[PDB]
């Protein structure tokens, strides 16, 4: 508990909204933290990305240079304007090789052409940073020359105006980045997969709009049940159909089918392979879906968090605590059925299950272990993080360890956390918690 370092940032900037690990080719591991309301040189809250090196004292970090200036590009009798004000840069930061992808779903982008305009909607733009080569590229599948009238006339089909690109970001083992934006297709959500190398090669300065040949977007669905379902709120990459070559995508939607929520496993071609639905309604089933073989037999298993789930112990009193649903993949080409296991929290109104950060294996014996977030748990009601020690049969209901929130009330400690990465190379994952309320990030090393 003593070795719990704190990383700070600019005063009043919500430092800790999103966090991740970066491992450049040089071999140095750092923590990428995205503050949506970073104060730039223009005294405006736009967004900042801090590449904090591993320091015992933590503290302020040197903000990595990014193009925060608006680009008023002119091309094809059209004006492309990048409204970077209140863009919330850093909502999703990931790394791969020597490339850091930092997405700004709230980065409004506008196209002006005569009276008609494309509107400065939160399309979402992702900056690719390569400090070794000093490259600052941009990628935005949502951005397009299509006007609002075109989308309106075609029944909003393939609506890519309010995607909020970069809401969820994952990096595949092959080297292709997959971004899931629940705001796409008019809040239905979408997924876009693209190689990093192709976009890096095709990028040119002062363009801001160029079609990518290697892009692969999700297929639109006209079923009303998907309307407002947020198909893409949580994104995970794994294998479920037994094809090691192909990468399967798990999409967790908390509002699918009239707020019920669900999780859909699809092949690499964005074709639905299987579907799973939660038991209780209004529990926000699909906020964060994780893929990991808890039993440990080569088949990935699904973990879903429902912070708003309501349980009861005595007097038939329905109290909101939260729940975790575990689905185990059956042996062989067999479809999954009812949830394998259900785990319940302890604290009241703790939103237990808001975020799930896989921890791989804690004791490094063979049994996978995980961590889940209780952003407003604890006896005081500030925050909690619950570590579940997995078992071959499944996941134990009672957490192995519980970490409280040392920050004051309202810190929302535990809202965003990530693991499965080692900073000190001690053989075990190091936990990071993005407490935005206190504008600080707490790094703690899990010692079994």
């Amino acid at each position: 508990p003593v070795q719990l370092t704190f990383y700070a940032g600019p005063n009043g900037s919500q430092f800790g909204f999103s966090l991740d690990f970066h491992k450049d080719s040089h071999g140095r591991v750092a923590i990428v933290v995205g503050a949506p309301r970073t104060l730039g040189p223009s005294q405006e809250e736009t967004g900042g990305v801090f590449l904090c090196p591993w320091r015992a004292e933590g503290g302020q970090c040197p903000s990595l240079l990014f193009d925060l200036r608006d680009e008023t590009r002119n091309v094809g009798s059209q004006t492309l304007q990048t409204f970077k004000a209140r863009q919330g840069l850093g909502a999703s930061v990931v790394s791969w090789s020597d490339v850091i992808v930092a997405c700004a779903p709230w980065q409004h982008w506008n196209v002006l052409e005569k009276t008609e305009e494309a509107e400065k909607t939160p399309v979402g733009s992702c900056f690719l940073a390569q400090p070794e080569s000093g490259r600052r590229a941009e990628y935005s599948p949502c951005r397009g020359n299509t006007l609002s009238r075109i989308y309106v006339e075609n029944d909003f089909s393939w609506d890519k105006r309010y995607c909020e690109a970069g809401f969820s970001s994952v990096v595949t083992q092959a080297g292709e980045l997959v971004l899931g934006a629940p705001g796409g297709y008019y809040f239905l959500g979408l997924l876009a997969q693209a190689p990093v190398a192709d976009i890096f090669s095709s990028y040119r300065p002062g363009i801001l709009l160029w079609h990518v040949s290697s892009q692969s977007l999700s297929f639109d669905s006209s079923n009303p049940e998907y309307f407002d379902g947020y198909w893409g709120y949580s994104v995970a990459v794994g294998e479920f159909d037994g094809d090691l070559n192909t990468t399967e995508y798990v999409v967790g939607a908390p509002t699918w089918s009239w707020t019920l929520g669900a999780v859909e496993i699809l092949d690499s071609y964005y074709q639905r392979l299987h579907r799973l639905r939660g038991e209780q309604m209004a529990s926000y089933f699909g906020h964060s879906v994780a893929v990991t073989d808890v039993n440990g037999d080569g088949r990935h298993d699904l973990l879903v968090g429902a912070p708003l789930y309501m349980e009861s112990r005595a007097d038939r009193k329905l109290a909101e605590v939260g729940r975790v649903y575990l689905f185990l993949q059956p042996r062989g080409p067999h479809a999954l059925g009812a949830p394998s296991l259900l785990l319940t929290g302890t604290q009241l109104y703790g939103r237990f299950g808001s975020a799930i950060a896989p921890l791989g294996d804690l004791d490094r014996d063979g049994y996978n272990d995980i961590a889940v977030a209780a952003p407003y748990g604890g006896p005081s009601g500030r925050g909690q993080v619950l570590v579940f020690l997995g078992q071959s049969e499944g996941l134990r209901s009672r957490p192995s360890q519980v970490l409280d929130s040392p920050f004051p009330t309202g810190s929302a400690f535990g809202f965003s956390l990530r693991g499965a990465v080692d900073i000190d190379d001690n053989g075990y994952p190091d936990l990071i918690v993005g407490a935005y309320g206190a504008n600080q990030v707490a790094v703690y090393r899990a010692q079994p």
Binding site: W258, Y284, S354
Partner: protein
């Protein structure tokens, strides 16, 4: 037998009666060899000496104001009898029964949350009726009632609102070339009050706004209504009802992540001097747990009136949320009125009483006999009282000694009822025969003593019956 009256007394009428209430005085002259004038009334009767001069005071309760209780027009009699007059003797105990019946109707405070989304516009008219019509139902159901309402659209933050062109901020309905008021998170309109006409006028004055996503922030409005007390003016001693109207999906907790809002909505009021949710841009949709806790703590019943299109969603919500009900919001609101009546029919009050303006010297005991017809001692109020029920309490009061005031007045006030029982108590320490006085009489040894109801008390020590034993003489051995 000797009893207690004969012994430890036989000195004067006051002391003779002070030995015990069950003592009598024989004023008329008789044989003093038998130690008369202080013994049981039966013994004195066996010994005669009853020439209409018997001094055997008793405690009698006299009712002054005993107007009948209301049964169903300017009386409103809740406690009967109203004013009581009582006479007590030192070291005495007496019982009296007091009956109380409910008369006044149960007060009610109703809050109405309305959505002003673009989609709601088609059904907006209907929901307005559901407000005023509901008020009418309560107008004919009770006399004391307060009604208030507020409106909500969605949080004022992207993407919930259009920002391009800049005029979209003041008029987001730019694509359709129509004028709509700016969308807002929560805007309390009318505080709880009895002015039904003003309520209807303000409800009709409300207009519609526009948003982007179908879900709407109703949970924020519910929390604001159930968390603010001064702004809403809730009454502690009255039932509370909440009616929320909607046509489409409703935003739930953690949805603000899309708009960049993650801080929850705590149990605090954030509406002062502006009638707006100032912290809407920095507070997230409260979850069902917080709303349920607020409803339970504040004793508020929630009725979700929704269209048949998505009625199943709110039926599920009600199943998940205890204490709330679901109704159909359409051209006919019967499915809502019936549920409102059913909820109002479960209201139960309590009948408790307190006593004021009584010296601590007097002692009191009570028993309770509620509608169950079961006598319970030591309980001053049962549970589960309903309008029209009559509860009778038998209060026994015991007084020791004669207070110097000789006149007292105290009150019995039921809890929550203006009407009270005024009881005036009097005491008669001295005997009536003493009114004769006769300070000087020849029977006190030639006018050398005082005479009192057949006994001569004389000098500082003269104790003989004839007032002749002196103080230094009369020492037989």
């Amino acid at each position: 037998g000797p009893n207690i009256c004969t012994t430890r007394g036989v000195s004067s009428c006051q002391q003779c009666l002070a030995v015990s209430p069950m003592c009598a005085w024989c004023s008329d002259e008789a044989l003093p060899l038998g130690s008369p004038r202080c013994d049981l009334k039966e013994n004195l009767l066996k010994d005669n000496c009853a020439p209409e001069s018997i001094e055997f005071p008793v405690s009698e309760a006299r009712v002054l104001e005993d107007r009948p209780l209301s049964d169903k027009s300017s009386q409103v009699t809740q406690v009967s009898p109203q004013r009581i007059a009582l006479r007590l003797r030192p070291d005495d105990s007496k019982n009296f029964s007091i009956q109380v019946r409910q008369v006044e109707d149960y007060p009610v405070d109703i809050y109405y949350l309305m959505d002003l989304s673009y989609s709601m516009k088609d059904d907006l008219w209907s929901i307005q009726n559901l407000g005023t019509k509901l008020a009418t139902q309560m107008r004919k159901l009770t006399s004391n009632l307060r009604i208030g309402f507020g409106a909500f659209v969605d949080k004022p933050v992207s993407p919930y609102m259009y920002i391009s062109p800049p005029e979209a901020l003041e008029n987001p309905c730019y694509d359709m070339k129509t004028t709509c008021l700016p969308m807002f998170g929560y805007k309390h309109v009318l505080t709880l009050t009895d002015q039904v006409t003003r309520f209807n006028e303000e409800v009709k004055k409300q207009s519609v706004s526009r948003n982007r996503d179908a879900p709407e922030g109703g949970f924020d409005a519910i929390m604001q209504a159930t968390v603010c007390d001064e702004k809403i003016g809730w009454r502690n001693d009255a039932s509370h009802l909440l009616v929320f109207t909607t046509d489409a999906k409703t935003h739930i907790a953690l949805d603000g992540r899309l708009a960049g809002i993650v801080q929850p909505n705590d149990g605090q009021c954030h509406v002062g001097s502006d009638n707006h949710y100032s912290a809407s841009t920095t507070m997230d949709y409260p979850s069902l747990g917080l709303m349920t806790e607020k409803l339970s703590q504040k004793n508020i019943n929630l009725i979700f009136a929704v269209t048949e299109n998505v009625v199943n969603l709110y039926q599920n919500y009600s199943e998940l949320i205890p204490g709330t009900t679901v109704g159909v919001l359409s051209m006919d609101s019967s499915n809502v009125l019936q549920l409102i009546v059913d909820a109002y029919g479960k209201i139960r009050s309590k009948v408790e009483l307190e006593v004021r303006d009584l010296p601590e010297e007097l002692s009191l005991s009570f028993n309770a006999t509620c509608l169950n017809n079961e006598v319970i001692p030591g309980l001053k109020s049962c549970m589960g009282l309903k309008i029209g029920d009559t509860v009778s309490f038998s209060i026994e009061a015991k007084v020791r000694g004669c207070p110097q005031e000789k006149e007292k007045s105290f009150t019995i006030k039921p809890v929550g009822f203006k009407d009270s029982l005024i009881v005036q108590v009097t005491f008669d320490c001295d005997c009536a025969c003493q009114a004769q006085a006769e300070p000087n009489s020849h029977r006190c040894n030639n006018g050398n003593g005082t005479f009192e109801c057949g006994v001569c008390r004389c000098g500082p020590g003269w104790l003989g019956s004839q007032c002749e034993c002196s103080e230094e003489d009369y020492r037989p051995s």
